Motif scaffolding. Structure first.
Motif, short mmCIF file in Angstrom:
data_model
loop_
_atom_site.label_atom_id
_atom_site.label_comp_id
_atom_site.label_asym_id
_atom_site.label_seq_id
_atom_site.Cartn_x
_atom_site.Cartn_y
_atom_site.Cartn_z
N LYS A 1 -22.72 -40.07 41.66
CA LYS A 1 -21.92 -41.10 42.32
C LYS A 1 -22.80 -42.11 43.04
CE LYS A 1 -18.25 -37.80 43.01
NZ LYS A 1 -17.18 -38.47 42.22
N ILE A 2 -23.97 -41.68 43.50
CA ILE A 2 -24.85 -42.57 44.24
C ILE A 2 -25.26 -43.73 43.35
CG2 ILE A 2 -26.70 -40.97 43.70
CD1 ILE A 2 -28.16 -42.07 46.15
N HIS A 3 -24.97 -44.95 43.80
CA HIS A 3 -25.31 -46.15 43.06
C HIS A 3 -25.71 -47.24 44.02
CE1 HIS A 3 -24.15 -49.61 40.15
NE2 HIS A 3 -25.41 -49.25 39.98
N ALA A 4 -26.77 -47.96 43.68
CA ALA A 4 -27.17 -49.15 44.41
C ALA A 4 -27.52 -50.23 43.40
CB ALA A 4 -28.35 -48.88 45.35
N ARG A 5 -27.40 -51.48 43.82
CA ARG A 5 -27.70 -52.59 42.93
C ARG A 5 -28.28 -53.73 43.75
NH1 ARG A 5 -25.11 -55.99 38.43
NH2 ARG A 5 -25.98 -58.03 38.99
N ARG B 1 -30.19 -56.66 41.95
CA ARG B 1 -29.82 -57.67 40.98
C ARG B 1 -29.82 -57.02 39.61
NH1 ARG B 1 -33.73 -61.04 43.95
NH2 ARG B 1 -32.55 -62.39 45.36
N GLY B 2 -28.99 -57.54 38.72
CA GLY B 2 -28.84 -56.92 37.43
C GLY B 2 -28.07 -57.77 36.44
N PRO B 3 -27.57 -57.13 35.39
CA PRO B 3 -26.84 -57.87 34.36
C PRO B 3 -25.55 -58.45 34.90
CG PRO B 3 -26.70 -55.51 33.97
CD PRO B 3 -27.62 -55.69 35.12
N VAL B 4 -25.18 -59.61 34.37
CA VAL B 4 -23.95 -60.29 34.75
C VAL B 4 -23.07 -60.38 33.51
CG1 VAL B 4 -25.28 -61.61 36.42
CG2 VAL B 4 -24.62 -62.66 34.27
N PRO C 1 -21.53 -60.11 38.60
CA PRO C 1 -22.04 -58.76 38.35
C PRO C 1 -21.10 -57.96 37.46
CG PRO C 1 -22.49 -59.33 40.59
CD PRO C 1 -21.86 -60.56 39.96
N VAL C 2 -21.68 -57.19 36.55
CA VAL C 2 -20.90 -56.39 35.61
C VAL C 2 -20.21 -55.26 36.36
CG1 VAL C 2 -22.42 -56.99 33.71
CG2 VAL C 2 -22.85 -54.94 35.01
N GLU C 3 -19.28 -54.58 35.69
CA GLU C 3 -18.52 -53.50 36.29
C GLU C 3 -19.02 -52.16 35.75
OE1 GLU C 3 -14.39 -53.72 35.51
OE2 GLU C 3 -13.96 -51.70 36.23
N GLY C 4 -19.38 -51.26 36.66
CA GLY C 4 -19.72 -49.91 36.24
C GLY C 4 -20.99 -49.36 36.84
N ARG C 5 -20.93 -48.11 37.32
CA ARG C 5 -22.14 -47.42 37.75
C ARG C 5 -23.10 -47.23 36.59
NH1 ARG C 5 -24.75 -43.17 40.22
NH2 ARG C 5 -25.41 -41.57 38.72
N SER C 6 -22.57 -46.86 35.42
CA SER C 6 -23.42 -46.63 34.26
C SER C 6 -24.04 -47.92 33.76
CB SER C 6 -22.61 -45.97 33.15
OG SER C 6 -21.55 -46.83 32.74
N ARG C 7 -23.38 -49.05 33.99
CA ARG C 7 -23.85 -50.34 33.53
C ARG C 7 -24.68 -51.07 34.59
NH1 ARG C 7 -24.37 -49.84 28.28
NH2 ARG C 7 -22.89 -51.16 27.14
N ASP C 8 -24.94 -50.42 35.72
CA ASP C 8 -25.67 -51.01 36.85
C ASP C 8 -24.89 -52.18 37.43
OD1 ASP C 8 -27.65 -51.24 38.74
OD2 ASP C 8 -28.92 -52.51 37.48
#
Lengths: 48, 51, 113
Positions: free
Chosen positions: B28-32, B34-37, B44-51
RNA sequence: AGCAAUAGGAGCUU
């Protein structure tokens, strides 16, 4: 512009256009079909 | 345990059947930063798996 | 993935001292000692040894967070006495008591045979 | 120095 209707990639080599793009293509087909009636026979039940 | 002194109160003590649920913090732990849009909105994209 | 190593409890780094002494200026002749890499085992032993001396006026300890392996100890003494000397005195006393305890246990164990 | 979309389903905490 295509920004509002960008294409996408499904499996690394394939692309389908956005809905707006296919809709514009259908509109263009309709327009050209309209331009094929006022140029020849058109018995009033195809123009409408 | 820290002092070996008796506790002033008595403690309800014994075995109990517990369960290991599927919800783990490491899933569950997720941080972001900057990443894919997204292509369309550039948000920002949607999803922990997608960053 | 965020779990630290289970050996940082006891392995002293090279840049981290075992012991660090700072004075408490609010009250006279008091010092604050931080013991790194120790826990209740040494803290309670030292505290209850020091608490029974006449010249020790204040002694206490705490482990501010259970997830970090250290404790801090406040110790005050009377005017003539220094808290450091009393700390060595308590350590030596517990060492002697443990030596006597060990000797008596070994003799008793031999006699039990 | 670049990791698709749309849906449905099952779940988490209120």
């Amino acid at each position: 512009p295509p920004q509002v209707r960008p294409s996408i990639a499904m499996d690394e080599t394939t692309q389908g256009q956005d809905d707006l793009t296919h809709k514009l293509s259908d509109i263009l087909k309709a327009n050209i079909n309209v331009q094929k009636l006022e140029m020849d026979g058109s018995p009033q039940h195809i123009i409408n | 345990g820290h002092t070996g002194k008796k506790l002033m109160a008595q403690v309800f003590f014994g075995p109990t059947y517990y369960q290991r649920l599927r919800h783990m913090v490491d899933d569950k732990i997720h941080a972001r930063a900057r990443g894919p849009v997204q292509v369309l909105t550039r948000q920002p994209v949607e999803g922990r798996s997608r960053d | 993935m965020n779990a630290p190593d289970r050996f940082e409890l006891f392995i002293l780094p090279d840049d981290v001292p075992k012991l660090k002494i700072t004075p408490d200026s609010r009250v006279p002749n008091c010092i604050i000692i931080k013991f790194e890499r120790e826990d209740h085992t040494l803290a309670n032993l030292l505290r209850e040894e020091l608490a029974l001396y006449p010249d020790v006026t204040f002694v206490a300890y705490k482990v501010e967070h259970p997830l970090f392996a250290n404790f801090v100890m406040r110790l005050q003494t009377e005017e003539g006495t220094r808290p450091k000397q009393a700390l060595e005195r308590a350590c030596a006393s517990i060492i002697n008591k443990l030596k006597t305890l060990d000797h008596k246990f070994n003799e008793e164990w031999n006699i039990k045979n």
